[PDB]
Design a protein around this ligand. Structure first.
Ligand SMILES: [Mg+2]
Ligand SMILES: [Mg+2]
Ligand SMILES: [Mg+2]
Ligand SMILES: [Mg+2]
Ligand SMILES: [Mg+2]
Ligand SMILES: [Mg+2]
Ligand SMILES: [Mg+2]
Ligand SMILES: [Mg+2]
Ligand SMILES: [Mg+2]
Ligand SMILES: [Mg+2]
Ligand SMILES: [Mg+2]
Ligand SMILES: [Mg+2]
Ligand SMILES: [Mg+2]
Ligand SMILES: [Mg+2]
Ligand SMILES: [Mg+2]
Ligand SMILES: [Mg+2]
Ligand SMILES: [Mg+2]
Ligand SMILES: [Mg+2]
Ligand SMILES: [Mg+2]
Ligand SMILES: [Mg+2]
Ligand SMILES: [Mg+2]
Ligand SMILES: [Mg+2]
Ligand SMILES: [Mg+2]
Ligand SMILES: [Mg+2]
Ligand SMILES: [Mg+2]
Ligand SMILES: [Mg+2]
Ligand SMILES: [Mg+2]
Ligand SMILES: [Mg+2]
Ligand SMILES: [Mg+2]
Ligand SMILES: [Mg+2]
Ligand SMILES: [Zn+2]
Lengths: 79, 50, 158, 71, 102
RNA sequence: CAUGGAAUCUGUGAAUUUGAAAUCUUCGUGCAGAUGCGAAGGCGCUGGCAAGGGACGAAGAGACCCUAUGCAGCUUCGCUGG
RNA sequence: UACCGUACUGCAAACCGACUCAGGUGGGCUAGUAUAUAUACUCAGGCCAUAGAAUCAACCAUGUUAAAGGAACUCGGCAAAAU
RNA sequence: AGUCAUAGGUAGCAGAACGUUCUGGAACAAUUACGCUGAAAACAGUAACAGAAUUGAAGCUGCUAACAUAAGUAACACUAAAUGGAUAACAUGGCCGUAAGCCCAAGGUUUUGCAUAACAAACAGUGAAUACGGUU
RNA sequence: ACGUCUAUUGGACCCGAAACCGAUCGAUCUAGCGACGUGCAGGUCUGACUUUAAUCAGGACCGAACCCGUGUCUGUUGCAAGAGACUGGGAU
RNA sequence: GGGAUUGCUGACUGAUAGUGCAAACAGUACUGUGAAGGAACUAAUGAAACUGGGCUAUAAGUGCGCAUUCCACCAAUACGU
């Protein structure tokens, strides 16, 4: 009867009929061109005077290893 | 006056009337959603997407 | 298996404005996917030697950022990225008619297309590699040119 | 303004006599290319005839003329 | 009719159906002359008839909300060319064209 | 007289209706106004284009009247209730 | 200095009317004769695809002209004409 | 096995049978049937004895599906107008021009581009870098 | 007891109402209200203010954009389950 | 009373039947603003309406796959293979 319980049952019902977006989901997929849906991005800042300011600690940093060249493990193991 | 064109489309009004949150805002809307679930409808509300 | 949840337009309207996180960690084990599209064969020969192009277009997932694509290319592939331009695309609709005629309809997963403009690596900048004619003569020739024919119809024979 | 009963197969056939076409009693046949048309109509290559070999016209000599070509 | 004046009767009308009838008669003639060994210029169209085909049902929009139909019809053609014991009367006099002129 | 339908040809291409029909006229008869019964007579057969007297043309199992253990709403010095 | 929109259509064959539906659909910009965004012709621009082909049917719709009269028509000058 | 008597029927009442599906009695169609007739009818020609029935259909302006009739009939008349052997690029003519032009909004959501048929949707296409609209 | 036929209670041989009682969804059509924003070509008349002057009023008048639908005609399984043409009414 | 496994259970039904659904995606397509309503479709065989033409005018065998019971290993108490 609670609000969260109804939403959880809706999501469990939507767990079935999932995968590559068949049926009604083909039309419902076009809601992203109709109501400005925000995608799964991480926000890097905030507007103060309408000019966006990217906070430098929220800029993306990738900890790549020192050398991936002549490293002795490949993505494939011999049979 | 010609009839038949009562449906004037609007996304704001469609989501604000038959969306998930107005259904969840009231108890009888929540039993409407519950019997939509018990019937087995693939689309629960007019604004559901993934 | 846990997968993509349904989202609701009224729910994103009500619980709106995602906030920036308080801390950002350097990303060990990143989950980010890029792929090129088709290149012209002369561009493919341009990549086969010296490994460079000024403009390369990529398919990504729509949860990425221009900063993330620029940082990933600079960090992993050693490139110099000047600017990124991102376009959100819908999936293609697919039709796969069944044993009884049903019109089974699919939709591909939504993708983001990035246009990445590159920069010459170090000292190699010569490979930008490009008489006159008056623009008054250009416009006057392009005004006396024959018009484009109207588009034929798919049943029409010409 | 409305049929009161259903028309029978015999009555329908009798009513449909106006719809039938009359057979033509003459045809102009080209001996070479086997083309078929009316005797008052050109049916050679200038008209529609992809089978024309030109043997339909058996003589056409006209070399001499003199005029001012306007250019 | 015999075969040549049947081709003449099909070739002398502007109807769309006459081209399909020409296609059926030409296919029957090709079977009779090259698949079989029947003599030409003695073939008579002794059996030709039209049977029903599978239709494509449609819809037409009458006024006041009433539906209608624009069903696309189809048909089949059976042509049988017999060989006569004698070359027959051609039934349509062959005259010279406009091209055959001095 | 002008324009556009209609009428001719080519191409696309419905629906109302429909017990089965191979459905004449007059007079009489008849559930009381007969294409179908009786008497007499007429009629080569089938159509196109027109006109609509008939087929109690077709279109609504409700125009009006009556009936229901009928409903509904309204009215009141009809009845009963806080 | 990120994220979302950016194709195409938008008085319409792509929206709302079951339709390629003679209906309904908001705001803005604009040249000359010329003078008002009215009216006639035209600029920039666009269009002459969604049945075609001839011809003297009757009849129907929409109009032009009509001798002498003139509401005599008709329930009623309705409709046309007229200013 | 020879004489006599009875046999029009609506509503209604009584009696005798035919047929369909399934089951019990161990199994009645593996390799088919097909001399075309028989019987008063329902029907029969792949048992029979009993039993259990969602058991028999021209007949409810019944429901579903298919196929006819009207009938190749009506319609393809709101508009600017087309012509040259092409829904032509070229030429000629015409129509709108406070629209039938241009730019957006709402809404639609790929309807958008490519082949002198073709094997082409399976392929492409929407780039914020002017303090563009939103998010505030 | 079984079999058959009636009878009673059940929806009780089948199909068919108008109904009545509850509690879901609907003001995207339409009626009223409320908040914010936008629009009203061209002229005409009257009253007022200021005038070396680029201001206001009238449920004013004629008339486009726009709103409505008076009369006639067409249409009546229509272009349209209420439309078209011409006249019309309002248009600070 | 309710929710899932099993039924050497069925004089229950067999694709207009049986659940609304035996099916690649049935509470689907589609209808409606919405609540809500809500289909059709198995594999062969191919009846009738309908429309053209013609005419008339030996209740058996043999193979596979299991189930029952024997046997011999068994957890050694229901059979475990
Ligand atoms: Mg109006
Ligand atoms: Mg509707
Ligand atoms: Mg005409
Ligand atoms: Mg009489
Ligand atoms: Mg006659
Ligand atoms: Mg007639
Ligand atoms: Mg009474
Ligand atoms: Mg309009
Ligand atoms: Mg309509
Ligand atoms: Mg329209
Ligand atoms: Mg003009
Ligand atoms: Mg045209
Ligand atoms: Mg006079
Ligand atoms: Mg008797
Ligand atoms: Mg007797
Ligand atoms: Mg048995
Ligand atoms: Mg029964
Ligand atoms: Mg025709
Ligand atoms: Mg042309
Ligand atoms: Mg848009
Ligand atoms: Mg962008
Ligand atoms: Mg008893
Ligand atoms: Mg409400
Ligand atoms: Mg007016
Ligand atoms: Mg007035
Ligand atoms: Mg069923
Ligand atoms: Mg079926
Ligand atoms: Mg059922
Ligand atoms: Mg089958
Ligand atoms: Mg048969
Ligand atoms: Zn020739």
């Amino acid at each position: 009867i609670g609000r969260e319980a109804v939403v959880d049952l809706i999501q469990q019902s939507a767990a079935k009929q999932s995968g590559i977006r068949k049926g009604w989901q083909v039309k419902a997929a076009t809601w992203v061109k109709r109501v400005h849906v925000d995608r799964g991005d991480v926000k890097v800042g905030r507007l103060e005077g309408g000019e966006f300011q990217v906070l430098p600690h929220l800029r993306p940093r990738y900890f790549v290893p020192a050398d991936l060249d002549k490293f002795q493990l490949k993505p494939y193991v011999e049979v | 006056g010609n009839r038949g064109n009562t449906y004037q489309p609007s996304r704001r009004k469609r989501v604000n009337r038959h969306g998930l949150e107005k259904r969840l805002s009231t108890p009888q809307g929540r039993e409407v959603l519950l019997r939509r679930l018990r019937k087995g409808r693939w689309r629960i509300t007019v604004d559901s997407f993934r | 298996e846990q997968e993509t949840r349904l989202r609701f337009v009224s729910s994103e309207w009500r619980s709106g404005r995602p906030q920036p996180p308080e801390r950002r960690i350097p990303i060990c084990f990143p989950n980010i996917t890029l792929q090129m599209m088709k290149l012209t064969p002369e561009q493919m020969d341009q990549v086969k030697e010296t490994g460079w192009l000024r403009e390369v277009a990529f398919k990504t997932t729509p949860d990425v950022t221009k900063l993330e694509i620029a940082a990933f290319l600079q960090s992993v592939y050693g490139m110099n990225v000047e600017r990124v331009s991102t376009i959100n695309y819908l999936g293609r609709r697919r039709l796969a008619i069944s044993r009884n005629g049903k019109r089974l309809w699919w939709r591909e997963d939504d993708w983001k297309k990035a246009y990445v403009i590159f920069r010459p690596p170090a000292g190699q900048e010569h490979l930008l590699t490009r008489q006159q004619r008056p623009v008054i003569e250009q416009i006057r020739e392009a005004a006396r040119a024959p018009r484009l024919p109207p588009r034929p119809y798919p049943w029409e024979r010409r | 303004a409305t049929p009161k009963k259903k028309l029978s197969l015999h009555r329908r056939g009798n009513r449909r006599v106006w719809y039938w076409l009359k057979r033509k009693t003459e045809v102009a046949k080209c001996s070479y290319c086997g083309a078929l048309s009316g005797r008052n109509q050109m049916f050679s290559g200038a008209a529609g005839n992809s089978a024309c070999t030109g043997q339909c016209v058996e003589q056409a000599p006209t070399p001499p003329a003199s005029s001012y070509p306007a250019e | 009719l015999p075969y040549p004046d049947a081709v003449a009767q099909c070739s002398l009308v502007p109807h769309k159906a006459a081209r399909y009838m020409l296609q059926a008669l030409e296919a029957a003639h090709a079977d009779a002359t090259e698949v079989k060994g029947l003599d030409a210029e003695r073939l008579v169209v002794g059996t030709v008839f039209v049977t029903r085909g599978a239709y494509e049902p449609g819809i037409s929009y009458h006024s006041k909300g009433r539906p209608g139909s624009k069903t696309f019809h189809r048909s089949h053609i059976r042509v049988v060319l017999n060989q006569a014991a004698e070359r027959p009367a051609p039934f349509a006099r062959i005259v010279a064209p406009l091209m055959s002129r001095r």
